[PDB]
């Protein structure tokens, strides 16, 4: 049955998860420290909000050309 | 200790298990006293660790150093800090005394005697023993009177206390001839709590402070001797509930009123809470705004008695609902304010026009400017100003922190008084567990409710 | 099967939770999103 | 033998056999609440305009002065008065008293007394009935909130004009001005209060639907389901075990309420403690503690300020600020 | 093993710890 | 700031206020130790 | 089934595999509930952590930016997109997940998947109540949160100019939406909203007062001061005194409950009716059918400067909200209102 | 003309409140 | 079934439900009258 009292108090569980829990923590750390979050999720880096072209908030102002317009307006 | 099967109280009510266990009860109390003395020492040393000589004590989030400085330690004329060694000594004495009290609390909690009755009849008590309950009350009343007289002694012969009402910005002054007049002492008590009277929060001079302390110390010692040498009267016996939880409920209602009173003292009083150490009060900051905008526009060559507002009332000066001249604007609601920086400019007709035009002082003008720039306005982030302001200044007034925290504590302690008054009455009655299911009172009452 | 006490495990995970929340409250005063 | 006048009156006051229990708390409640009810109704119908802000701009507030149910309000006391305790005998005329917001102060003082004695009377009836006593503790939450909007906020702000107007649109006005000055939405205690009333509706619908889900068959499709329950019956009318198994296999089998006692304790404690926290939210903002200030929190590497949702709140807050008390201000910073 | 309980607890724990490492990482990102 | 002799002891003073919060949490740890007995 | 042979099939095997006691009941509805709900919750937790709002609104709404819990959000897409479904394969994104995130497609993802997760949860309530053979009043109660969700996050943005005017999923964004409804819609004055307020506050009153009344009218079953150990799972007597509770509230309040079934049906009825009325009012606001004005009081206040009421103060405050929030909240209108024309009182 | 209607509706609700308090169906113990 | 209708039903409204109906209708009046008059 394992009613959650002998499975979180088991050294068999704890040895195998002494590597997966902090391996996950380190992987999440590197996902933010290596800028992969910036790359895959579209968030601009703290030094790349305003380019030389525009100095204000970007506006989409189109629908079917929205993809290439946000391409040209973003920081590449 | 014990379990639930031998006590009937679960862990979330485990302290209730030691209602009848006098030794463990005493140990829990003195261990708690160690906690109070420990926080006082720890926070005091932390505050003197985070203290900057330049900035006043209200800009730095200090709540204990202003208390010590109000007592008159390390401060001089105007409120500048001369030394922090008294504060350090206070903090260290508190830490070490907390170590001693914590040793005692741990001792009676872990290996102390279970009950103090069978061996130390002076200390052991039952809750229905009204004689010994009044005896312990008398011991503590004598202790309270001794503390009040310690403050009286400090004000009379041990350096004096800080007066903000003394000329020149205030200073540490020795109290001479306190007001021992019973009419002046008890007219504060009998006074209404509302505007213009403020109950006891409107005590506005150190002579009244120390005279009231003389009266409270002497009455407390007298009541201690009276309680040690008497037993409660039958009318009191009929009027009261005589269980330990009932005594706790009485204490909770009392300290709840005390917490609300301390909230109002921190928010309104400026003689027991000098504005140099605690910052300006709300009324003080509003009157300071109107005052400095008066003097700026005077120095810019304008008339102040004229120039009514958009409402036809008077931008700088109007008349209060009783007649005397007060500062114009919404700060009219704070026309009841009295501070050391307005009294030299305030006469019989309220604000004197010629005195307000001519008799300005530089220290008063700077004090008004700072009491504008450090108003008790802030957020939970400790961002100063109204909730729409920028994140540039890091300031929330110690008056704001004290008033808010102690209103919260006073409210929960009133609710705790309700909980304990009800449970003590129900436990004396036999209702603490539920209705008996065969001797239900409603079934013995007629219908139609 | 129960070779580590459940309360000891719970206290340690509570310590990591409190340390994590203390880190989260600390990081609001420094770096990004810190009003400075 | 019980022939004396005081003891006969005592047995009349303390009697459970009354249609409405009076008790010693009710002998303070009933005159105060009747006085407050009378003055509130009369003021709501025929109160002349009230100079709330102290700037000689009287606000009508009453039905006979051109207000409807939504717009009529007993207008707060004058800002010129502040907290100065204005009763009828202080005023020269009833005309002056009605001009300076006297009915509001009368209703507020009598209503605070009335709710305090209502909570006491709830305790005292529970005492004379052999009940357990903490229903008064549960009622201490709306009492705390009423005192926070009728007493504590005026005391912390210096003026009874700051109190909540006794009305509907006045309540809305109180909220708009309150958020303008204090940003209550960004306060954790108010967030707890909203969670408390949202969870109150959550758990009211939850418990009602679980009890109604597990009703026991006694009636037919002809008769309403309530007709299966008989007043004073000993058997329980629903299957607690069936509802508990339902909820457990619905969300989490262990994390349900196996004690109906503990379940009803949770139902009582959740909105009561959250309304306690949000009442202290108002009480702490009375002394200018306010909500969170997250304006210009995020800036870029070159120091430019990014707008944020908190900054949109700040923009709406400024709109709520400048327009409120448009003529009452003479100076930039609104310290008063 | 590989039970329904296993998958349902892993879907809510594995990204949770990964994300907690993520926020803790950005919690020390300067500007 | 602290006196010059107690300047190296300022970091250990900077933690001292949190001990009462640790005390109530320690009461809960003790109850977990006795398994909520 | 029903005294017939009915040889078994893959449907019956799958049904028997789904309808069984597990750690979590999956069921047929769990084919919808579990993935849609996981994706809605995980998408919200993803957007609040990484996905930016710099391009859809010109704001910051993620932890990677520096926002905390109270301030981060999954932002509604730009008004230019209108009511586009923002499919990742659709025209606006063109298959590309990265620039799909920053164009606002994550709001449409979270909204559609949250709606289907809500449908899956109500189907789960129906299914579990059927399997345990209990009446579906839990699903009838859950009908009101779905009514609120569809009227607020679906019907209202469909009625307005686009998804941009929907609530963005996040605490400060919800507060923006609320102050928006105050300034633009006068949602406080709406009778349907105040019916919702009465329903929710009355439901909280019922919850608190049923809890306190039950917890204070118990029967003894004692020999222990902890009352929580006086309850056994399977018995046939009332645990608290119904007659004592009725007597207490009859003498305190004047009226009291005397039917347990009607008491709990009232506890069910109050929040459902309140939330349904709020849903109907938001549907009215979807078409800008506001209860903004009282025509008689407005014409009286226009023909009399001396007429001043709290309602007129609210109207002025709403003008202040609109004019001070439009420029920064609506970038699509390109509203560059100068500091000159903004409404403003004396001083401040 | 409107204050008449509002006053009538308010006292009607109060009258129904009074009748519901003091003129309810008396509950029976059986 | 027979010449008379077999589904013959009686309707019931206790005084409590009368009170809820009257409060409900009068509260709808108090609430909505300000808006109908507008
Ligand atoms: C009778 C009991 C009624 C209690 C509430 C009535 C309102 C009390 C009040 O007006 O409160 C304020 C008063 C102080 O009054 C103020 O007193 C001030 C005194 O200051 C004056 O005097 C001072 C002297 O240092 C300074 O010089 C100061 O600058 C100068 O102006 C001013 O006069 C103000 O105008 C005046 O309003 O506080 C006090 O009296 C302290 C007494 C306790 C008040 C507690 C308020 C909350 C009460 C109940 C909450 C409980 C709820 C539980 C149930 C739910
Ligand atoms: C101000 C806080 C406070 C204090 C002073 C006490 C005090 C006490 N509690 Mg208690 N309790 C508290 C909070 C507190 N409690 C809280 C918040 C809860 C809810 C979780 C409980 C729940 C609870 C239960 C269920 C019980 C008690 C009991 C007791 C008594 C005996 C405990 C014991 O000896 O067991 C043994 C404890 C230990 C062996 C661990 C203690 C080790 C030390 C003392 C911890 C502190 C170390 C300290 C830093 C050392 C200082 C030394 C000095 C020289 C500086 C005791 C007097 C028991 C009782 O009622 O007696 C019958 C009981 O069963 N409490
Ligand atoms: C009760 C009186 C009191 C008062 C008036 C103050 C006031 C102050 N303190 Mg202090 N402090 C206190 C007690 C008090 N403290 C105690 C008991 C401790 C020991 C832990 C400390 C330790 C302490 C430190 C270490 C520091 C301060 C600091 C400060 C200053 C800044 C406050 C701030 O921004 O923090 C933030 C404000 C809050 C965190 C709000 C508190 C939240 C409440 C109390 C809990 C939430 C309620 C909860 C939701 C309800 C649920 C109930 C239950 C289920 C938990 C300020 C003047 C700072 C300072 O200036 O140093 C000089 C500083 O760093 N205090
Ligand atoms: C989280 C718990 C907590 C914390 C951290 C605080 C913290 C604080 N409280 Mg407090 N309080 C609390 C809970 C708490 N409180 C609760 C639950 C209540 C009941 C509702 C109260 C009610 C309360 C009141 C009534 C007051 C405070 C006050 C204070 C402040 C000063 C404390 C003080 O000096 O008292 C005093 C210390 C003692 C009485 C112990 C004896 C000290 C002796 C008598 C002093 C000797 C001085 C002597 C003159 C020195 C000269 C020596 C010689 C030459 C003669 C302080 C910051 C005060 C305040 O500032 O108001 C805002 C105050 O008046 N609190
Ligand atoms: C913390 C201190 C403390 C405590 C807990 C007690 C507790 C008690 N005292 Mg007491 N007493 C004290 C201090 C204290 N005393 C002091 C300092 C003195 C000297 C003045 C006295 C002198 C005294 C006497 C002469 C008697 C008691 C008595 C009693 C017992 C019954 C009191 C009663 O019936 O309720 C409260 C009493 C009343 C409600 C009626 C008193 C009338 C008013 C309220 C008194 C104050 C007037 C003033 C206008 C009130 C407004 C102040 C307010 C706004 C703050 C009780 C156990 C009686 C007793 O049993 O003797 C053994 C009694 O005869 N005490
Ligand atoms: C000095 C005052 C005082 C004292 C001595 C007692 C003493 C006692 N109380 Mg009690 N109580 C008090 C005040 C006090 N109470 C207050 C102010 C309230 C609030 C209304 C309560 C509400 C209360 C309840 C509901 C109960 C008791 C109970 C008890 C008994 C067992 C307590 C226990 O071990 O629980 C265990 C302690 C814990 C589980 C720890 C509680 C953790 C809290 C929730 C965290 C709060 C911390 C947080 C920072 C607060 C911030 C709020 C604010 C400052 C912003 C005991 C004799 C029980 C009883 O009746 O037994 C007979 C019980 O049921 N009390
Ligand atoms: C370090 C230092 C220092 C020093 C100090 C000292 C040297 C001190 C101390 C200390 C101490 C020394 C403390 C203490 C404590 C104590 C206590 C805390 C006490 C007590 C008592 C009691 C508690 C009692 C009780 C009782 C009895 C038993 C009998 C009868 C009854 C009664 C109750 C009375 C200084 C600051 C200079 C400098 C810096 C550093
Ligand atoms: C029994 C019990 C308990 C407990 C209680 C208590 C409350 C206790 C305590 C205690 C205490 C109350 C303690 C305290 C202490 C103290 C100490 C231990 C100290 C010290 C000292 C020092 C060493 C210092 C030093 C210094 C100086 C001198 C200054 C400068 C700096 C420095 C810091 C270096 C509990 C709850 C858990 C559970 C139940 C039972
Ligand atoms: C220091 C000071 C002062 C002085 C003060 C004093 C001198 C105080 C006192 C006082 C007193 C001398 C008080 C008294 C009190 C008392 C109370 C507050 C009480 C109570 C109680 C009650 C409420 C009761 C109840 C009841 C009844 C009614 C009958 C039956 C029984 C019973 C219990 C239920 C002054 C302000 C000048 C200035 C500042 C500082
Ligand atoms: C995007 C997307 C997607 C989805 C995804 C998902 C669905 C995932 C996830 C996820 C998740 C699922 C995440 C998470 C996170 C979490 C977190 C981050 C947490 C938390 C918590 C906290 C931080 C807190 C804690 C605490 C403490 C420590 C103290 C006290 C208590 C509490 C609880 C408050 C895909 C790819 C399919 C595609 C489409 C789009
Ligand atoms: C609630 C709970 C829990 C838990 C959690 C935790 C994690 C807790 C904790 C806690 C803690 C974390 C504790 C600690 C503590 C400690 C203490 C309480 C101490 C002390 C002492 C003292 C008094 C000190 C002193 C001193 C000084 C003064 C200076 C220097 C030197 C020395 C250090 C010695 C669990 C989950 C299991 C289950 C559920 C419930
Ligand atoms: C607070 C007023 C009292 C002022 C003087 C206080 C000093 C001590 C006074 C206590 C007088 C003792 C009274 C004695 C009472 C007897 O024990 C009883 N009548 C029984 O003999
Ligand atoms: O009344 Mn309504 O709003 Ca509270 O801040 Mn001051 O006072 Mn008035 O101004 Mn801003
Ligand atoms: Cl306004
Ligand atoms: Cl102003
Ligand atoms: Fe129930
Ligand atoms: Na203004």
mmCIF file with all atom_site columns, N, CA, C and O and ligand atoms in Angstrom, chain B residues 39 63-64 67 150-151 158 255 258-259 262 273 406 409 413, ligand 4:
data_model
loop_
_atom_site.group_PDB
_atom_site.id
_atom_site.type_symbol
_atom_site.label_atom_id
_atom_site.label_alt_id
_atom_site.label_comp_id
_atom_site.label_asym_id
_atom_site.label_entity_id
_atom_site.label_seq_id
_atom_site.pdbx_PDB_ins_code
_atom_site.Cartn_x
_atom_site.Cartn_y
_atom_site.Cartn_z
_atom_site.occupancy
_atom_site.B_iso_or_equiv
_atom_site.pdbx_formal_charge
_atom_site.auth_seq_id
_atom_site.auth_comp_id
_atom_site.auth_asym_id
_atom_site.auth_atom_id
_atom_site.pdbx_PDB_model_num
ATOM   1   N  N   . UNK B 1 39  ? 14.198 39.366 24.040 1.00 0.00 ? 39  UNK B N   1
ATOM   2   C  CA  . UNK B 1 39  ? 13.891 40.220 22.904 1.00 0.00 ? 39  UNK B CA  1
ATOM   3   C  C   . UNK B 1 39  ? 14.301 41.650 23.173 1.00 0.00 ? 39  UNK B C   1
ATOM   4   O  O   . UNK B 1 39  ? 14.791 42.333 22.274 1.00 0.00 ? 39  UNK B O   1
ATOM   5   N  N   . UNK B 1 63  ? 12.689 51.524 17.739 1.00 0.00 ? 63  UNK B N   1
ATOM   6   C  CA  . UNK B 1 63  ? 11.550 51.590 18.644 1.00 0.00 ? 63  UNK B CA  1
ATOM   7   C  C   . UNK B 1 63  ? 11.928 51.441 20.116 1.00 0.00 ? 63  UNK B C   1
ATOM   8   O  O   . UNK B 1 63  ? 11.074 51.687 20.980 1.00 0.00 ? 63  UNK B O   1
ATOM   9   N  N   . UNK B 1 64  ? 13.158 51.046 20.457 1.00 0.00 ? 64  UNK B N   1
ATOM   10  C  CA  . UNK B 1 64  ? 13.558 50.939 21.859 1.00 0.00 ? 64  UNK B CA  1
ATOM   11  C  C   . UNK B 1 64  ? 14.497 52.060 22.284 1.00 0.00 ? 64  UNK B C   1
ATOM   12  O  O   . UNK B 1 64  ? 14.394 52.574 23.410 1.00 0.00 ? 64  UNK B O   1
ATOM   13  N  N   . UNK B 1 67  ? 12.687 54.996 23.496 1.00 0.00 ? 67  UNK B N   1
ATOM   14  C  CA  . UNK B 1 67  ? 12.240 54.832 24.878 1.00 0.00 ? 67  UNK B CA  1
ATOM   15  C  C   . UNK B 1 67  ? 13.354 55.172 25.861 1.00 0.00 ? 67  UNK B C   1
ATOM   16  O  O   . UNK B 1 67  ? 13.151 55.943 26.816 1.00 0.00 ? 67  UNK B O   1
ATOM   17  N  N   . UNK B 1 150 ? 10.423 53.743 40.875 1.00 0.00 ? 150 UNK B N   1
ATOM   18  C  CA  . UNK B 1 150 ? 11.729 53.811 40.229 1.00 0.00 ? 150 UNK B CA  1
ATOM   19  C  C   . UNK B 1 150 ? 11.739 54.866 39.134 1.00 0.00 ? 150 UNK B C   1
ATOM   20  O  O   . UNK B 1 150 ? 12.721 55.602 38.983 1.00 0.00 ? 150 UNK B O   1
ATOM   21  N  N   . UNK B 1 151 ? 10.654 54.960 38.361 1.00 0.00 ? 151 UNK B N   1
ATOM   22  C  CA  . UNK B 1 151 ? 10.573 56.037 37.368 1.00 0.00 ? 151 UNK B CA  1
ATOM   23  C  C   . UNK B 1 151 ? 10.525 57.405 38.041 1.00 0.00 ? 151 UNK B C   1
ATOM   24  O  O   . UNK B 1 151 ? 11.155 58.363 37.572 1.00 0.00 ? 151 UNK B O   1
ATOM   25  N  N   . UNK B 1 158 ? 17.881 61.110 39.491 1.00 0.00 ? 158 UNK B N   1
ATOM   26  C  CA  . UNK B 1 158 ? 18.812 60.281 38.733 1.00 0.00 ? 158 UNK B CA  1
ATOM   27  C  C   . UNK B 1 158 ? 18.990 60.770 37.300 1.00 0.00 ? 158 UNK B C   1
ATOM   28  O  O   . UNK B 1 158 ? 18.970 59.986 36.351 1.00 0.00 ? 158 UNK B O   1
ATOM   29  N  N   . UNK B 1 255 ? -5.191 43.969 29.793 1.00 0.00 ? 255 UNK B N   1
ATOM   30  C  CA  . UNK B 1 255 ? -4.075 44.300 28.914 1.00 0.00 ? 255 UNK B CA  1
ATOM   31  C  C   . UNK B 1 255 ? -4.547 44.627 27.504 1.00 0.00 ? 255 UNK B C   1
ATOM   32  O  O   . UNK B 1 255 ? -3.818 45.287 26.766 1.00 0.00 ? 255 UNK B O   1
ATOM   33  N  N   . UNK B 1 258 ? -5.089 48.169 27.764 1.00 0.00 ? 258 UNK B N   1
ATOM   34  C  CA  . UNK B 1 258 ? -3.759 48.761 27.848 1.00 0.00 ? 258 UNK B CA  1
ATOM   35  C  C   . UNK B 1 258 ? -3.100 48.851 26.477 1.00 0.00 ? 258 UNK B C   1
ATOM   36  O  O   . UNK B 1 258 ? -2.428 49.839 26.168 1.00 0.00 ? 258 UNK B O   1
ATOM   37  N  N   . UNK B 1 259 ? -3.289 47.833 25.636 1.00 0.00 ? 259 UNK B N   1
ATOM   38  C  CA  . UNK B 1 259 ? -2.725 47.869 24.297 1.00 0.00 ? 259 UNK B CA  1
ATOM   39  C  C   . UNK B 1 259 ? -3.364 48.922 23.412 1.00 0.00 ? 259 UNK B C   1
ATOM   40  O  O   . UNK B 1 259 ? -2.676 49.605 22.646 1.00 0.00 ? 259 UNK B O   1
ATOM   41  N  N   . UNK B 1 262 ? -1.992 52.197 24.557 1.00 0.00 ? 262 UNK B N   1
ATOM   42  C  CA  . UNK B 1 262 ? -0.630 52.393 24.068 1.00 0.00 ? 262 UNK B CA  1
ATOM   43  C  C   . UNK B 1 262 ? -0.612 52.756 22.591 1.00 0.00 ? 262 UNK B C   1
ATOM   44  O  O   . UNK B 1 262 ? 0.240  53.538 22.152 1.00 0.00 ? 262 UNK B O   1
ATOM   45  N  N   . UNK B 1 273 ? 6.286  60.659 24.269 1.00 0.00 ? 273 UNK B N   1
ATOM   46  C  CA  . UNK B 1 273 ? 6.891  60.151 23.044 1.00 0.00 ? 273 UNK B CA  1
ATOM   47  C  C   . UNK B 1 273 ? 7.418  61.360 22.293 1.00 0.00 ? 273 UNK B C   1
ATOM   48  O  O   . UNK B 1 273 ? 6.791  61.817 21.327 1.00 0.00 ? 273 UNK B O   1
ATOM   49  N  N   . UNK B 1 406 ? 0.299  47.597 17.986 1.00 0.00 ? 406 UNK B N   1
ATOM   50  C  CA  . UNK B 1 406 ? -0.366 47.488 19.266 1.00 0.00 ? 406 UNK B CA  1
ATOM   51  C  C   . UNK B 1 406 ? -1.875 47.551 19.153 1.00 0.00 ? 406 UNK B C   1
ATOM   52  O  O   . UNK B 1 406 ? -2.553 46.996 20.017 1.00 0.00 ? 406 UNK B O   1
ATOM   53  N  N   . UNK B 1 409 ? -2.496 43.823 18.428 1.00 0.00 ? 409 UNK B N   1
ATOM   54  C  CA  . UNK B 1 409 ? -2.352 43.022 19.638 1.00 0.00 ? 409 UNK B CA  1
ATOM   55  C  C   . UNK B 1 409 ? -3.470 43.297 20.636 1.00 0.00 ? 409 UNK B C   1
ATOM   56  O  O   . UNK B 1 409 ? -3.972 42.366 21.274 1.00 0.00 ? 409 UNK B O   1
ATOM   57  N  N   . UNK B 1 413 ? -6.125 40.488 21.873 1.00 0.00 ? 413 UNK B N   1
ATOM   58  C  CA  . UNK B 1 413 ? -6.211 40.171 23.286 1.00 0.00 ? 413 UNK B CA  1
ATOM   59  C  C   . UNK B 1 413 ? -7.592 40.435 23.859 1.00 0.00 ? 413 UNK B C   1
ATOM   60  O  O   . UNK B 1 413 ? -8.002 39.735 24.790 1.00 0.00 ? 413 UNK B O   1
HETATM 61  C  C1  . LIG J 2 .   ? 5.114  40.476 19.830 1.00 0.00 ? 4   LIG J C1  1
HETATM 62  C  C2  . LIG J 2 .   ? 4.992  40.926 21.260 1.00 0.00 ? 4   LIG J C2  1
HETATM 63  C  C3  . LIG J 2 .   ? 5.302  42.309 21.675 1.00 0.00 ? 4   LIG J C3  1
HETATM 64  C  C4  . LIG J 2 .   ? 6.398  43.078 21.429 1.00 0.00 ? 4   LIG J C4  1
HETATM 65  C  C5  . LIG J 2 .   ? 7.629  42.728 20.648 1.00 0.00 ? 4   LIG J C5  1
HETATM 66  C  C6  . LIG J 2 .   ? 6.144  44.335 22.080 1.00 0.00 ? 4   LIG J C6  1
HETATM 67  C  C7  . LIG J 2 .   ? 7.007  45.447 22.107 1.00 0.00 ? 4   LIG J C7  1
HETATM 68  C  C8  . LIG J 2 .   ? 6.822  46.693 22.722 1.00 0.00 ? 4   LIG J C8  1
HETATM 69  N  N1  . LIG J 2 .   ? 5.732  47.053 23.426 1.00 0.00 ? 4   LIG J N1  1
HETATM 70  MG MG1 . LIG J 2 .   ? 3.989  45.745 23.763 1.00 0.00 ? 4   LIG J MG1 1
HETATM 71  N  N2  . LIG J 2 .   ? 2.357  44.524 24.248 1.00 0.00 ? 4   LIG J N2  1
HETATM 72  C  C9  . LIG J 2 .   ? 2.178  43.340 23.705 1.00 0.00 ? 4   LIG J C9  1
HETATM 73  C  C10 . LIG J 2 .   ? 3.152  42.680 22.939 1.00 0.00 ? 4   LIG J C10 1
HETATM 74  C  C11 . LIG J 2 .   ? 4.388  43.097 22.472 1.00 0.00 ? 4   LIG J C11 1
HETATM 75  N  N3  . LIG J 2 .   ? 4.930  44.292 22.693 1.00 0.00 ? 4   LIG J N3  1
HETATM 76  C  C12 . LIG J 2 .   ? 0.859  42.777 23.980 1.00 0.00 ? 4   LIG J C12 1
HETATM 77  C  C13 . LIG J 2 .   ? 0.391  41.449 23.483 1.00 0.00 ? 4   LIG J C13 1
HETATM 78  C  C14 . LIG J 2 .   ? 0.232  43.716 24.744 1.00 0.00 ? 4   LIG J C14 1
HETATM 79  C  C15 . LIG J 2 .   ? -1.166 43.659 25.303 1.00 0.00 ? 4   LIG J C15 1
HETATM 80  C  C16 . LIG J 2 .   ? -2.142 44.112 24.238 1.00 0.00 ? 4   LIG J C16 1
HETATM 81  C  C17 . LIG J 2 .   ? 1.177  44.811 24.895 1.00 0.00 ? 4   LIG J C17 1
HETATM 82  C  C18 . LIG J 2 .   ? 0.897  46.055 25.447 1.00 0.00 ? 4   LIG J C18 1
HETATM 83  C  C19 . LIG J 2 .   ? 1.802  47.136 25.468 1.00 0.00 ? 4   LIG J C19 1
HETATM 84  C  C20 . LIG J 2 .   ? 1.629  48.388 26.189 1.00 0.00 ? 4   LIG J C20 1
HETATM 85  C  C21 . LIG J 2 .   ? 0.547  48.915 27.096 1.00 0.00 ? 4   LIG J C21 1
HETATM 86  C  C22 . LIG J 2 .   ? 2.788  49.096 25.869 1.00 0.00 ? 4   LIG J C22 1
HETATM 87  C  C23 . LIG J 2 .   ? 3.575  48.315 25.027 1.00 0.00 ? 4   LIG J C23 1
HETATM 88  C  C24 . LIG J 2 .   ? 4.753  48.960 24.680 1.00 0.00 ? 4   LIG J C24 1
HETATM 89  C  C25 . LIG J 2 .   ? 5.854  48.297 23.883 1.00 0.00 ? 4   LIG J C25 1
HETATM 90  C  C26 . LIG J 2 .   ? 7.163  48.918 23.492 1.00 0.00 ? 4   LIG J C26 1
HETATM 91  C  C27 . LIG J 2 .   ? 8.035  49.182 24.709 1.00 0.00 ? 4   LIG J C27 1
HETATM 92  C  C28 . LIG J 2 .   ? 7.965  48.030 25.696 1.00 0.00 ? 4   LIG J C28 1
HETATM 93  C  C29 . LIG J 2 .   ? 8.181  48.569 27.078 1.00 0.00 ? 4   LIG J C29 1
HETATM 94  O  O1  . LIG J 2 .   ? 9.121  49.311 27.283 1.00 0.00 ? 4   LIG J O1  1
HETATM 95  O  O2  . LIG J 2 .   ? 7.344  48.219 28.025 1.00 0.00 ? 4   LIG J O2  1
HETATM 96  C  C30 . LIG J 2 .   ? 7.694  48.405 29.429 1.00 0.00 ? 4   LIG J C30 1
HETATM 97  C  C31 . LIG J 2 .   ? 8.527  47.433 30.226 1.00 0.00 ? 4   LIG J C31 1
HETATM 98  C  C32 . LIG J 2 .   ? 8.126  47.074 31.455 1.00 0.00 ? 4   LIG J C32 1
HETATM 99  C  C33 . LIG J 2 .   ? 6.865  47.601 32.065 1.00 0.00 ? 4   LIG J C33 1
HETATM 100 C  C34 . LIG J 2 .   ? 8.900  46.111 32.311 1.00 0.00 ? 4   LIG J C34 1
HETATM 101 C  C35 . LIG J 2 .   ? 9.415  46.841 33.541 1.00 0.00 ? 4   LIG J C35 1
HETATM 102 C  C36 . LIG J 2 .   ? 10.433 47.902 33.155 1.00 0.00 ? 4   LIG J C36 1
HETATM 103 C  C37 . LIG J 2 .   ? 10.763 48.864 34.288 1.00 0.00 ? 4   LIG J C37 1
HETATM 104 C  C38 . LIG J 2 .   ? 9.544  49.204 35.133 1.00 0.00 ? 4   LIG J C38 1
HETATM 105 C  C39 . LIG J 2 .   ? 11.357 50.123 33.676 1.00 0.00 ? 4   LIG J C39 1
HETATM 106 C  C40 . LIG J 2 .   ? 12.418 50.739 34.574 1.00 0.00 ? 4   LIG J C40 1
HETATM 107 C  C41 . LIG J 2 .   ? 12.905 52.046 33.971 1.00 0.00 ? 4   LIG J C41 1
HETATM 108 C  C42 . LIG J 2 .   ? 13.598 52.903 35.014 1.00 0.00 ? 4   LIG J C42 1
HETATM 109 C  C43 . LIG J 2 .   ? 12.981 54.286 35.057 1.00 0.00 ? 4   LIG J C43 1
HETATM 110 C  C44 . LIG J 2 .   ? 15.074 52.996 34.676 1.00 0.00 ? 4   LIG J C44 1
HETATM 111 C  C45 . LIG J 2 .   ? 15.800 53.895 35.669 1.00 0.00 ? 4   LIG J C45 1
HETATM 112 C  C46 . LIG J 2 .   ? 16.739 53.081 36.550 1.00 0.00 ? 4   LIG J C46 1
HETATM 113 C  C47 . LIG J 2 .   ? 16.980 53.743 37.902 1.00 0.00 ? 4   LIG J C47 1
HETATM 114 C  C48 . LIG J 2 .   ? 17.971 54.891 37.771 1.00 0.00 ? 4   LIG J C48 1
HETATM 115 C  C49 . LIG J 2 .   ? 15.679 54.207 38.549 1.00 0.00 ? 4   LIG J C49 1
HETATM 116 C  C50 . LIG J 2 .   ? 7.830  47.803 22.686 1.00 0.00 ? 4   LIG J C50 1
HETATM 117 C  C51 . LIG J 2 .   ? 8.497  48.177 21.380 1.00 0.00 ? 4   LIG J C51 1
HETATM 118 C  C52 . LIG J 2 .   ? 4.696  50.363 25.233 1.00 0.00 ? 4   LIG J C52 1
HETATM 119 C  C53 . LIG J 2 .   ? 4.581  51.348 24.105 1.00 0.00 ? 4   LIG J C53 1
HETATM 120 O  O3  . LIG J 2 .   ? 5.579  51.820 23.593 1.00 0.00 ? 4   LIG J O3  1
HETATM 121 O  O4  . LIG J 2 .   ? 3.405  51.719 23.622 1.00 0.00 ? 4   LIG J O4  1
HETATM 122 C  C54 . LIG J 2 .   ? 3.331  51.788 22.201 1.00 0.00 ? 4   LIG J C54 1
HETATM 123 C  C55 . LIG J 2 .   ? 3.471  50.349 26.092 1.00 0.00 ? 4   LIG J C55 1
HETATM 124 O  O5  . LIG J 2 .   ? 3.098  51.257 26.803 1.00 0.00 ? 4   LIG J O5  1
HETATM 125 N  N4  . LIG J 2 .   ? 2.970  47.102 24.770 1.00 0.00 ? 4   LIG J N4  1
#
